[PDB]
Design a protein around this ligand. Structure first.
Ligand SMILES: [Mg+2]
Ligand SMILES: [Mg+2]
Ligand SMILES: [Mg+2]
Ligand SMILES: [Mg+2]
Ligand SMILES: [Mg+2]
Ligand SMILES: [Mg+2]
Ligand SMILES: [Mg+2]
Ligand SMILES: [Mg+2]
Ligand SMILES: [Mg+2]
Ligand SMILES: [Mg+2]
Ligand SMILES: [Mg+2]
Ligand SMILES: [Mg+2]
Ligand SMILES: [Mg+2]
Ligand SMILES: [Mg+2]
Ligand SMILES: [Mg+2]
Ligand SMILES: [Mg+2]
Ligand SMILES: [Mg+2]
Ligand SMILES: [Mg+2]
Ligand SMILES: [Mg+2]
Ligand SMILES: [Mg+2]
Ligand SMILES: [Mg+2]
Lengths: 159, 147, 48, 125, 187, 225
RNA sequence: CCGACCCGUCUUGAAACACGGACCAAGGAGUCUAACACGUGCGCGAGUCGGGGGCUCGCACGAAAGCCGCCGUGGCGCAAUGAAGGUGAAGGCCGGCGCGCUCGCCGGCCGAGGUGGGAUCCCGAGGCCUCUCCAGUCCGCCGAGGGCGCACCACCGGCCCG
């Protein structure tokens, strides 16, 4: 009974945020998108050309083709019980770079620098980041102040 | 051998391997290629594209003999003569080249797939491909036509 | 030329610890002579 | 060869008896009378066989000569052994072990000869 | 109870040849012993190839074997294939080859022998190189068969080039609707 | 030539026996050193608490790095996330046990399957009893009982673990090679709790058995194996 | 003593106030042909197949079996593509020349290109040997790296037809 319109249910998702309507900021156009980098699809409603479908809003893909105004993105879509990597054409207004990739690459650069420096100075260093370890033993100074005693409060109907 | 068949293993099973719900009925869905455009359309579209319609000119009284022109490639060309011919031509001091008549072998057109050994040869054929002719000329051979 | 330059650059040279000692002896190869020595010591008895 | 003929007759043979979840072989030179490659008395280039003598006393030990493999008339040499039990078994042991003539059939022939010798003497009352 | 799915416990693989060929079973016995009592993985590969069906043992042409032996460093090595050596009349010169194969075509065998070559059965190979040392294990084109032109994505789907099953080939046989844009669609 | 081959066999046998003796002596000394280390740890906790109490302050012990997780519910009607996690904990049958190294990832992972497990912080005696009574090794995909030290040595000797005592040291003190030592052990096939249960369907803090009983897991272990 | 509703069937659900069944014996229901498709076994293998005909004391079996080869006509395969007229599947390297102009004329070789994987195989520094060594003799094993890379997969090239 649901219609199959290309924008059904997109009343809020493609809408502009509050007091962010109007002219699209230009810095979204001077971004450089090479092939093989990671982008996040947004799909603003100000530019109706080259919009992605509602099933790609919020998904993350990899750019495989660059054109005059848009890019080609390989993005995974789940259909029933299979993941097929769809290729979509999205204009650059609706995408932005993924900061997870940038954080990973800067971690790689730091790791390589750390390896070079450690092989210089001989002493081993840790690279594989660890999950939050259990806290080690420590002392808690009272500083001559008795810890405050707490009772539960009496009940009273306030509202 | 009926003793090796699946019926001998289905004795005692009431449905005989055809299910209790849907059963085995006479012809659910039609007989033969019934409903190729209505309810078996997905199967025909998916596995037999192009099945429905007319394409091209219809020609009454086609005679298959008229267009009979079997072909032979260049790589299999030297198999039409005995190896004695090949070695005699290869070791020959003079420039004499053997003559291979493919019509005698039952082939009418000489196609150009493959490459030839570098030794001259005369090929008697009804039709020649352009690249076949070029490859025969490149090894110093010659092409002649027969009717 | 890059292979030659890099290759000529590369070739351009110039306690007791009882548990540790026991782990050294217990090695099948590093501790062969040690256990041979202790076997000879346990076998032969000599004065002084 | 022995292996090839075995693959031929391991399941299709007139001497094969398949009954009561058991298998037996009835060719003349089969000690233990079992259907097995080791004990088969036809496929091997050399075999031994212990049978009772024609008269009801002593055993006959048949062995296969190397020369006439395709010559079944003279391929088998039979010697009749009609001595006491210990001497008979010692003679069979010497025939098999000293000649190295199939040492894997030594105890088989010893046991079969013992069984035949006990079958030969009169039963108790 | 215990929480394991049991639908994949029974691995499907050839533990023995389906054939009743007594010679094949004999050399299967030989290479079973060789693979069990040696550390050579070549014996394992040969043994598991002897189990394979005929479609899994495609014939090896003479030309392909010559081409593979002619690669650098494979001089004076034994070419081993579990299958049939097949003559290729498209090749004219045959070098000296030392080949072990399950079967050799009479014409291919004649060409190999007249070229000064040697042909070994697998028992002869076992006597020669029991570990398979100095051998080049080859295989024929496994997907060189007509059935694989029909296998793949369905013919009536976009971007599929798989051969449909037709009783005859001609302009009247599955070429109109779904094959050209002039009749409905093309995909 | 019989004499020199006899001498060869005698020398090879003697060398093998001397190697065996040296390895046994190493095992003995390592167990002694582990005993010393354990009593140092146990007395150190007491001493730290005592000096903090002398100063009038509070000594917060390091929260434990090792946990023992026991699956207490069956395999019927389990949600897919819980089932997947229990498969990841190697707890695929009721009353299995597994030593789980504690960190943020493992703690959240245990929080997911909280109604289905009962876990806590084992002491040394629980570890010794577990490894010695129900210790089975996954040696070449086979549940092999740890009856000889050679079984541990062949599979884990590359990590320095060559005996029962070394394995217990890597389990109790969560060592550098804890992952290999713990995955080497088959999940423990604990029996039913003798003396019964309080209630398996509610949390421990509300009178039941599910969830984290922080040191009372040792009582369950004693009644369990 | 404990447990224990009548089977078959349709059904979400049958002991059902749902239908068939009083009892017993015998009979009683996925077959054959044709055409495909895939898998497996066998023979030969760029071939293969005599199935129709013919030749062999005409016939117990034998209406079988054997053979034909200038009986392979023919079928399937070995070449595709186009509605059709028709056309119809080999490149790489080193060169001298125009003007080595994004190409035209020849040489010499090689003989279906290349990339990433790739079972297998090959080389292999270095190790393992004994009553000990300074001294090298023959072969075995482990072995870091390296090399040729089957089939097959992904990709990029190349060739034929419209
Ligand atoms: Mg809404
Ligand atoms: Mg059933
Ligand atoms: Mg229905
Ligand atoms: Mg069970
Ligand atoms: Mg089941
Ligand atoms: Mg329940
Ligand atoms: Mg009780
Ligand atoms: Mg519940
Ligand atoms: Mg009914
Ligand atoms: Mg109803
Ligand atoms: Mg009922
Ligand atoms: Mg009722
Ligand atoms: Mg009624
Ligand atoms: Mg009814
Ligand atoms: Mg009635
Ligand atoms: Mg009735
Ligand atoms: Mg009846
Ligand atoms: Mg006939
Ligand atoms: Mg013809
Ligand atoms: Mg490759
Ligand atoms: Mg291409």
């Amino acid at each position: 009974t649901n219609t199959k319109g290309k924008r059904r249910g997109t009343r809020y998702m493609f809408s502009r945020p509050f007091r962010k309507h109007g002219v699209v900021p230009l810095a979204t156009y001077m971004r450089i998108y090479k092939k093989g980098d990671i982008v996040d699809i947004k799909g603003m409603g100000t530019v109706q050309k080259g919009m992605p479908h509602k099933c790609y809003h919020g998904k993350t893909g990899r750019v495989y083709n660059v054109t005059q105004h848009a890019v080609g993105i390989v993005v995974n879509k789940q259909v029933k019980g299979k993941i097929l990597a769809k290729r979509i054409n999205v204009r650059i207004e609706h995408i932005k770079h993924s900061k997870s990739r940038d954080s990973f690459l800067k971690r790689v650069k730091e790791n390589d620098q750390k390896k070079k420096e450690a092989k210089e100075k001989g002493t081993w260093v840790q690279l594989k980041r660890q999950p939050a370890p259990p806290r080690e033993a420590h002392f808690v100074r009272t500083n001559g102040k008795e810890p405050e005693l707490l009772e539960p409060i009496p009940y009273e109907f306030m509202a | 051998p009926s003793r090796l068949r699946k019926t001998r293993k289905l004795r005692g099973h009431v449905s005989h391997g055809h299910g209790r719900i849907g059963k085995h009925r006479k012809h659910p869905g039609g007989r033969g290629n019934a409903g190729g455009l209505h309810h078996h359309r997905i199967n025909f579209d998916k596995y037999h594209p192009g099945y429905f319609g007319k394409v091209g000119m219809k020609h009454y009284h086609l005679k298959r003999n008229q267009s009979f022109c079997p072909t032979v490639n260049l790589d299999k060309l030297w198999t039409l003569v005995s190896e004695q011919t090949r070695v005699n031509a290869a070791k020959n001091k003079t420039g004499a080249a053997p003559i291979i008549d493919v019509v005698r072998s039952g082939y009418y057109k000489v196609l150009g797939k493959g490459k030839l050994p570098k030794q001259p040869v005369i090929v008697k054929a009804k039709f020649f491909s352009r690249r076949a002719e070029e490859k025969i000329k490149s090894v110093g051979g010659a092409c002649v036509l027969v009717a | 030329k890059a292979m030659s330059a890099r290759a000529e650059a590369i070739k351009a040279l110039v306690v007791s610890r009882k548990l540790d000692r026991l782990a050294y002896i217990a090695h099948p190869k590093l501790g062969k002579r040690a256990r041979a020595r202790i076997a000879k010591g346990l076998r032969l008895c000599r004065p002084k | 060869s022995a292996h090839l003929q075995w693959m031929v007759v391991r399941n299709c043979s007139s001497f094969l008896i398949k009954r009561n979840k058991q298998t037996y072989s009835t060719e003349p030179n089969n000690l233990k009378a079992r259907n097995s490659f080791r004990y088969n008395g036809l496929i091997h280039r050399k075999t031994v066989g212990v049978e009772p003598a024609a008269d009801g006393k002593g055993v006959v030990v048949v062995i296969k000569r190397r020369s006439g493999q395709r010559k079944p008339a003279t391929s088998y040499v039979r010697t009749t052994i009609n001595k006491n039990a210990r001497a008979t078994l010692s003679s069979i042991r010497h025939m098999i072990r000293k000649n190295k003539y199939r040492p894997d059939l030594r105890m088989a022939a010893i046991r079969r000869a013992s069984a035949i010798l006990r079958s030969q003497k009169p039963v108790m009352v | 109870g215990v929480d394991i799915r049991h639908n994949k416990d029974r691995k499907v693989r050839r533990k023995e040849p389906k054939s009743q060929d007594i010679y094949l079973r004999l050399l299967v016995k030989l290479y079973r012993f060789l693979a069990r009592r040696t550390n050579s993985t070549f014996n394992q590969v040969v043994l598991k190839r002897l189990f394979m069906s005929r479609t899994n043992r495609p014939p090896l042409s003479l030309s392909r074997m010559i081409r593979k032996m002619k690669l650098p460093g494979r001089e004076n090595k034994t070419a081993v294939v579990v299958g049939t050596i097949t003559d290729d009349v498209r090749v004219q010169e045959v070098p000296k080859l030392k080949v072990c194969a399950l079967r050799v075509t009479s014409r291919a065998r004649s060409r190999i022998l007249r070229a000064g070559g040697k042909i070994l059965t697998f028992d002869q190979l076992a006597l020669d190189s029991p570990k398979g040392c100095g051998t080049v294990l080859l295989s024929g084109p496994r997907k060189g068969r007509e059935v694989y032109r029909h296998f793949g994505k369905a013919p009536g789907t976009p971007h599929s080039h798989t051969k449909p099953y037709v009783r005859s080939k001609g302009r009247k046989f599955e070429r109109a609707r779904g094959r050209r844009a002039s009749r409905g669609y093309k995909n | 030539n019989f004499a020199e081959l006899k001498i060869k066999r005698l020398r090879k046998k003697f060398a093998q026996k001397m190697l065996r003796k040296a390895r046994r002596k190493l095992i003995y000394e390592k167990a002694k050193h582990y005993h010393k280390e354990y009593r140092q740890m146990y007395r150190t906790e007491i001493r730290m608490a005592r000096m903090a109490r002398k100063a009038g302050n509070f000594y917060v012990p390091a929260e434990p790095k090792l946990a023992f997780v026991i699956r207490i519910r069956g395999i019927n009607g389990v949600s897919p996330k819980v089932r997947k996690v229990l498969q990841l904990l190697r707890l695929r049958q009721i009353f299995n046990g597994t030593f789980v190294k504690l960190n943020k990832a493992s703690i959240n992972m245990l929080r997911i399957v909280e109604p289905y497990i009962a876990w806590g912080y084992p002491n040394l005696k629980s570890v010794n009893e577990l490894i010695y009574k129900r210790g089975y090794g996954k040696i070449n995909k086979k549940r092999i009982a740890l009856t000889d030290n050679a079984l541990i040595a062949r599979s884990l000797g590359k990590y320095g673990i060559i005996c029962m005592e070394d394995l217990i040291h890597e389990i109790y003190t969560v060592g550098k090679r804890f992952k290999e030592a713990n995955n080497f052990l088959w999940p423990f096939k604990l029996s039913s709790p003798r003396g019964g249960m309080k209630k398996k369907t509610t949390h421990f803090v509300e009178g039941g058995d599910a969830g984290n009983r922080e040191d009372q897991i040792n009582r369950l272990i004693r009644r369990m194996n």
